[PDB]
Amino acid sequence: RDLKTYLSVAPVASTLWFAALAGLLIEINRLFPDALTFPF
Amino acid sequence: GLSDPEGTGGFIEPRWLAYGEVINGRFAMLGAVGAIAPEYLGKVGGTYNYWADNYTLFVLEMALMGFAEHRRFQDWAKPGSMGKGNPAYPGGPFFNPLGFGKDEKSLKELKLKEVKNGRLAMLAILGYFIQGLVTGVGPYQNLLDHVADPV
Amino acid sequence: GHFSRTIAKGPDTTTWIWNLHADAHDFDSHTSDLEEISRKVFSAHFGQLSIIFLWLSGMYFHGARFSNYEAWLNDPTHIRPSAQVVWPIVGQEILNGDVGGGFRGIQITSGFFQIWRASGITSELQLYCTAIGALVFAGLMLFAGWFHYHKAAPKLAWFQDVESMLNHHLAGLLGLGSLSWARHQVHVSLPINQFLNAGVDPKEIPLPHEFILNRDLLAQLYPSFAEGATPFFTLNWSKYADFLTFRGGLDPLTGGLWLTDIAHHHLAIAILFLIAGHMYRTNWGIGHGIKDILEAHKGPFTGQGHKGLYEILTTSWHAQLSINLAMLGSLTIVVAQHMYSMPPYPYLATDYATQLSLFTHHMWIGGFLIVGAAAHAAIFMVRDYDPTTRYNDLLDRVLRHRDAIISHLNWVCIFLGFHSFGLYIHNDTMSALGRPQDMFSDTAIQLQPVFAQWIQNTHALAPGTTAPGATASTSLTWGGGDLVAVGNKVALLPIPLGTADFLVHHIHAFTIHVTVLILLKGVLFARSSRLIPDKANLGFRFPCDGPGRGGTCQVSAWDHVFLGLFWMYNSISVVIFHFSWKMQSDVWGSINDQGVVTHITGGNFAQSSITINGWLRDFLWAQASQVIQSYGSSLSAYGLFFLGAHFVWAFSLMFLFSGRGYWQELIESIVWAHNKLKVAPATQPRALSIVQGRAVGVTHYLLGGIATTWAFFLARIIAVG
Amino acid sequence: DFIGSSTNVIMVASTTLMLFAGRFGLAPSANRKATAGLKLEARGDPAGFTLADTLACGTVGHIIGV
Amino acid sequence: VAEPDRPLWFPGSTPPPWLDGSLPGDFGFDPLGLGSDPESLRWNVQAELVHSRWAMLGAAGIFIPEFLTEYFTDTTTLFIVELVFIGWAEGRRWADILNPQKLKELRTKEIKNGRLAMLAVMGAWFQHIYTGTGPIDNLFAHLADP
Amino acid sequence: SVFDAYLEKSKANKELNDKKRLATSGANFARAYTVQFGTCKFPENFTGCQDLAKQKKVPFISEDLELECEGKDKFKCGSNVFWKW
Ligand code: CLA
Ligand code: CLA
Ligand code: CLA
Ligand code: CLA
Ligand SMILES: CCCCCCCCCCCCCCCC(=O)OC[C@H](COP(=O)(O)OC[C@@H](O)CO)OC(=O)CCCCCCCCCCCCCCC
């Protein structure tokens, strides 16, 4: 089963990483949309 | 040339698929007479509904049948099975001992007449199909009506 | 390189990564074993079919759950066909616009809505099933490829039996395929649509299967179906003529071809492909040896001819691929010019947005495939041409007088170019100087296309005379005095041909001839040339052979496809432009109560398309206003993609106007900055190869260019139509 | 139906019969029109009882149209 | 500790080289191979174990509704204390994962029952979802009629 | 809450007490449905009480159905299971 892991460790890694990154960013924007500034 | 094989083979060319042909020689047989049995036992004295929905029986028609028809392959694929009283020492094509009581009896061939009873019951039961389908009436209505007005 | 071991080996430069994808499908470079290749591509076709099958499943699925097809069905005239919905994120929801039927979605132009009405589809239930059936097929196709490469791969002998394959494909697929569809029409499409045209409403239509079972429902209309025995076995066939006719023309209520005709069409096509299927020799005697027949043709001019062809087209894929690509592309083009002139779908012609995008889509697909024929034809010359083993003789001579063919074709393009573009530069100059009498115009010195005008004239007077069975014309562009108007929109109308139409056709003659020149020159001179006597040893895809001989850049057959690729863009790009303006100016419009027809641009094509300034102003500048004013509306995306395409386009010029020598030297300075901070990759960064930079360049050029009109057109017709 | 029926059903089975005559040929054993009609013509001829009912319905369809 | 005799799931045959019956409960099952690496299995093993141990208890939750035919501060604290507690618990268990012939029986049997709860604990809910009805009675309440 | 009215009498007594013999406490010592077995003595009825009958049988006559070889020899019956012409 070593094989599947490696398979998931090529440029696909990039897609999974960018999909995870996109999901994070979009969800952040859902909770805090129309953000023109950091006010805290 | 439909007949000649020469395959590895993904099974269109080699020996089986005529193997199956041998064994549907038997349930097109049990299927036929077993289907006329309710038809003419009532001769003396379309959704249609029985018990629950018969899809439920199915799950138990493809259940046991599963637990059954499964193993049968096992023998084929490889002689033994071994799980239960179960013996299946007979050859893969046929395993008469143990599930045929007392007899043991195959060579005349009968097998050539059992495959002869086979594919005539195929076309007999293939009768039943296109028969009651494109017409709209059962196999025994038009048949009786066919010796009635031949021309 | 996964495909090859040495190729896989190890990566030392980034060039390895680019090569890996570039030769991924180059199956004949991974092995010299023909059987291995053939086995590879055969499975690859399965994998393809799976993807398009999945593609179809999503189109039916989206039509079911994410579309207002039902809503469009009751009111097709002013409901906008819309599939797919956009989630309300980072301001996206504005792309969901008023399309009618109390629904928010993006207006579509694929034309599935018109297809589905023709098929007699009435409910999302029906679309839902077809989507699943497609997915089930997609699962099969994908599985089938795995089974025929790892379990049971066919012999080379299997693929070589071309006769048997021919017989089936133009009979088993074409014939029965046409026949099978012919049955669905008269049993489902024709009955249900007949109801739909009577304003019965979809839910008030009986289910399709009720039409098939009992003849009663199907027989009250089309009473030929009444006889159970049917007049078919009587072989009179005259009785059947109610459900199928040779009426032609166009239904004045639905604006599409009579399904009453298409059923008869397929009925003929089917058996016509069933008979023609019984031609080639197989096993049971009757048939043809294509090898034999091919040999028979010979000539005082050709000497031996076609002899040896059968050997070539049975051992070389690139040879077969070129032929197929050349005509499949050519077929896509004639499809574009047959669906616009003879609208085959209900409420298709009325939907201007769909028609523009359909014609334009088929023109590009057809255009690209033809260019691909040039590539593989050239690949065949470099990789598979061997006179020692497979001489043809036809191929010879061609190679023998190749300097002749190109030189003549070179001249024709110059003659055409002058006698096309020059006329416009004439008109542009005479109008600027204030002398329109001088120009090539209908009002001044006119150059009437009397030949095309004469062919149209005979098509008008065809029904009754040279076509008794035909009640009406083939297409209403050949009608004469007829006019179909579905809704308040004009479905079709006789299209006039003037001096403005004489010029533009001669531009298409030109652009096609030059495109042919570039591509054909690359195929013939793919192996040898006076400049490079051994080009074939350099391969099909090589950048050059040095600055020697004054400079030998882009001498490869690959680069001839590269140069001809821009020209195929230049070509179509002006065909679709001809289509857009002519249809808007002299065909599409609104018809009133009195019968007065007002076109979208108001017949300005005839006197303003004869000038270059006229296309730049009355066409581009004018009809752009939609795309450049689409911000804050539902067509917001088109405005962005219009700007987005203009960028990927100008982005291509960066790759096309420069060379890799500059870039590699620039990287050197950048690698230094990395080595200073321990951030130098072990995989050394290299610039793109000389050839890749051209490949990268043309792709972005075509993308930015094509994409840019896409947004042009789709913003225009939607806001106006 | 009746006799009339059986007369058209036999001539839609004799529409078949006329392309038997093309090629019928004969000359058996002499001259050669048979052997010639069994040389290239026909590689059997109920393949042409079968090529019969195919093109024959077409020949009637066209002889009315031609 | 190798044998071709173990009651395979699918009779004749079922032998993956990784599985051998050395482990307890080895019914020869894994077409996917979801663990062909010893690092792969050694982890899966522990995984398939802890699960079972939990599932059993879950079963002990099906034991309570037949005895009779949820907090002082709902969730929140009740979880953090749980997280904080089972954390440390599972914490050390983690550190241990990476750092008599009679007992085989016990452990072979332990897994199989354990295997049961999971299939069980599973079943009771995908029968409860979409289908708002408890399983409490169903044994002989649904046995009245299919 | 949960004991209240025997859990609304097992609930399931609410939607279906299967079959509770109707004509209750009358001619009940018989069967569900009541294609009546009835009391016990005289005929069961719910034809049923044809019972084998003689000619001009009842079923529910419109004109047709099937049925029997009554009297002396009538089968194949002209009305049903007989050659047509
Ligand atoms: C069922 C699972 C499965 C597994 C484990 C394998 C495994 C293997 N295959 Mg097989 N194959 C399969 C299914 C499978 N295949 C199916 C269903 C088909 C029919 C299409 C094929 C057709 C096939 C061919 C012709 C060949 C192989 C080969 C191989 C071997 C090398 C892998 C490789 O080609 O490189 C790369 C691995 C990839 C996954 C490449 C990706 C290709 C997929 C299909 C892309 C999917 C399309 C994608 C959606 C396009 C849109 C992209 C978009 C996002 C832009 C390897 C043993 C090769 C071989 O035997 O070596 C000499 C070989 O010649 N396969
Ligand atoms: C080959 C194996 C096989 C066998 C042995 C049977 C056997 C039977 N089938 Mg099955 N069947 C089979 C295969 C088989 N089938 C297959 C493969 C299919 C799929 C196509 C079917 C589909 C099927 C259907 C749909 C039905 C049957 C039915 C029947 C039963 C007939 C009852 C009936 O209504 O007809 C005629 C009536 C009789 C035989 C009753 C005889 C009564 C005698 C004459 C005495 C009358 C006196 C009376 C009972 C008073 C009691 C006095 C007492 C002391 C005698 C019978 C037990 C029927 C059934 O299930 O019954 C409810 C039925 O509806 N079968
Ligand atoms: C009938 C269809 C068909 C088939 C089966 C092939 C098959 C093949 N071609 Mg051919 N080709 C075709 C049509 C076809 N071609 C057409 C119509 C053209 C004209 C444009 C070409 C032009 C062409 C060239 C110049 C070459 C080939 C080559 C090849 C061979 C391998 C190359 C490869 O692996 O691809 C590699 C795939 C890539 C490098 C992917 C590139 C990225 C694409 C182009 C971007 C597409 C953009 C997308 C559609 C929209 C944007 C999406 C994005 C924004 C996300 C292979 C035998 C090569 C060869 O040497 O032959 C042996 C070769 O150099 N082809
Ligand atoms: C619109 C076309 C275009 C664009 C965008 C560029 C952009 C650039 N040029 Mg170029 N150039 C062009 C045309 C263009 N040029 C033409 C026609 C010529 C004459 C032949 C040149 C000649 C030229 C020279 C001689 C040089 C440049 C250089 C540069 C870089 C300068 C760095 C910079 O300012 O910003 C950085 C990059 C950008 C602003 C654009 C990057 C594109 C986007 C923003 C990246 C985001 C990608 C996004 C996620 C989309 C993903 C796509 C998806 C499919 C994955 C920049 C990449 C110089 C350089 O290389 O400096 C390092 C340099 O030496 N150019
Ligand atoms: C003014 C309006 C009147 C129209 C007449 C002028 C317009 C047509 C142009 C005349 C071309 C002559 C064709 C002769 C008919 C013809 O092609 O003859 C074909 C001739 C026949 O050779 P064979 O008899 O050997 O052929 C059989 C064997 O060779 C093959 O098995 O072969 C050659 O001529 C070889 C040299 C090629 C000749 C190259 C000339 C190509 C012309 C290019 C223009 C194409 C125009 C297409 C437009 C759609």
Q: Is C369 in the pocket of ligand 3 (CB under 6 A)?
A: yes
Q: How far apart are CA F81 and CA B141, in angstroms?
A: 9
Residue C655 CA to ligand 4 center (angstroms) comes to 10
Q: Is A1 on the interface with E (CB under 8 A)?
A: yes
**Residue in this structure with the two tokens 């013999």, named with its chain if needed:** F21
SS3 label, residue C124: helix
Residue A34 CA to ligand 4 center (angstroms) comes to 30
Nearest to C375 by CA among C52, C695, C88, C43: C695
Q: How far is CA C427 from CA C571, D56, F25, in A?
A: 22, 62, 109
Q: How far apart are CA C257 and CA C263, in angstroms?
A: 11
Q: How far is CA C719 from CA C113, C600, C635, in A?
A: 19, 12, 8
- Residue A5, annotated as binding a ligand: no
Amino acid letter for position C315: T
Q: Are E51 and E120 in contact (CB under 8 A)?
A: no
Is residue F8 left, alpha or beta, with left meaning phi > 0 and alpha meaning psi from -120 to 50?
Answer: left
C705 lies in which domain range? 1-721
- The set of residues, in sequence order, having a beta carbon less than 8 Å from that of C439 and lying 6+ positions away, is C426, C427, C430, C431, C445, C610
Q: Is C297 in the pocket of ligand 5 (CB under 6 A)?
A: yes
Ligand 4 atom closest to residue C658's alpha carbon, by position in its atom list = 20
Q: How far apart are CA C78 and CA C347, in angstroms?
A: 11
Kindly provide the residue ranges of all beta strands, DSSP E only, lying in C670-715, ordered along the sequence.
none
**Long-range pairs, E91-95, Cβ under 8 A, ≥24:** E93/E50
Q: How far apart are CA C83 and CA C99, in angstroms?
A: 10
> Which three-class secondary structure string do you get for D1-32?
CHHHHHHHHHHCCCHHHHHHCCCCCCCCCCCC
**Residue in this structure with the two tokens 């009541």, named with its chain if needed:** F34
Rounded (10°) CA dihedral C372, C373, C377, C380? 60
Nearest to C714 by CA among C618, C580, C614: C580
Q: Is C229 on the interface with B (CB under 8 A)?
A: no
Strand bridging mode C97-98 / C589-591: unpaired
Q: How far apart are CA B147 and CA C609, in angstroms?
A: 80
Residue C445, strand partner residues = C440
Q: How far apart are CA C345 and CA C365, in angstroms?
A: 21
**How many structural domains is chain C composed of?**
1
Domains of chain A as residue ranges with CATH:
1-40 (1.20.5.510)
**Residue in this structure with the two tokens 């994908």, named with its chain if needed:** C142
Element containing residue A4 per DSSP (H, E):
helix A2-7
- The set of residues, in sequence order, having a beta carbon less than 8 Å from that of C252 and lying 6+ positions away, is C484, C485, C486
Is residue B98 left, alpha or beta, with left meaning phi > 0 and alpha meaning psi from -120 to 50?
Answer: left
Element containing residue C98 per DSSP (H, E):
strand C97-98
Q: How far apart are CA C627 and CA C81, in angstroms?
A: 20
**Axis crossing angle, helix C557-586 with helix C499-524, rounded to the nearest 10:** 170
Residue C104, strand partner residues = C98
Residue nearest atom 6 of ligand 2, based on CA coordinates:
B34
Q: Is C432 on the interface with D (CB under 8 A)?
A: no
Q: How far apart are CA B55 and CA F16, in angstroms?
A: 24
Q: How far apart are CA C154 and CA F49, in angstroms?
A: 72
Nearest to C137 by CA among C251, C245, C45, C53: C53
Q: Tokens for C547?
A: 């600055």
> Which three-class secondary structure string do you get for C403-450?
HHHHHHHHHHHHHHHHHHHHHHHHHHHHHHCCCCCCCECCCCECCCCH
Strand bridging mode C104-105 / C97-98: antiparallel
Angle E85-E89-E90 (CA atoms, 0-180°, nearest 5)?
A: 115
**Residue in this structure with the two tokens 């239960």, named with its chain if needed:** B84
Helix, strand, coil fractions of chain B, as percent rounded to 5: 50, 0, 50
Distance from CA of F29 to the nearest CA of E (A): 22
Q: Is C228 on the interface with D (CB under 8 A)?
A: no
Q: How far apart are CA D46 and CA D27, in angstroms?
A: 19
Residue B27, strand partner residues = none
Nearest to E3 by CA among E27, E24, E16, E20: E20
Q: Are C190 and C219 in contact (CB under 8 A)?
A: no
Length of chain F counted residue by residue: 85
> What is the residue extent of each domain of chain B?
1-151
CATH code of the domain in which C694 resides: 1.20.1130.10
Q: How far apart are CA C566 and CA C699, in angstroms?
A: 10
Residue nearest atom 42 of ligand 4, based on CA coordinates:
C651
Q: Is C302 in the pocket of ligand 5 (CB under 6 A)?
A: yes
Angle C466-C467-C472 (CA atoms, 0-180°, nearest 5)?
A: 130
Q: How far apart are CA C389 and CA F17, in angstroms?
A: 90
Q: Are C609 and C500 in contact (CB under 8 A)?
A: yes
Q: How far is CA F58 from CA F37, F48, F54, in A?
A: 20, 11, 10
Q: How far apart are CA C635 and CA D32, in angstroms?
A: 79
Q: How far apart are CA C236 and CA C230, in angstroms?
A: 10
Q: How far apart are CA C263 and CA C356, in angstroms?
A: 26
Q: Is C40 in the pocket of ligand 1 (CB under 6 A)?
A: yes
Q: Tokens for C285?
A: 């005697």
Nearest to C536 by CA among C371, C386, C705: C386
Is residue C546 left, alpha or beta, with left meaning phi > 0 and alpha meaning psi from -120 to 50?
Answer: left
| Chains contacting D (3 or more CB pairs within 8 Å) | C
Q: How far apart are CA C588 and CA C597, in angstroms?
A: 9
Q: Tokens for D4?
A: 């009339």
What single string gives the DSSP state of each residue in E79-117? HHHHHHHHHHHHHHHHHHHT--THHHHHHHHHHHHHHHH
Q: Is B1 on the interface with C (CB under 8 A)?
A: yes
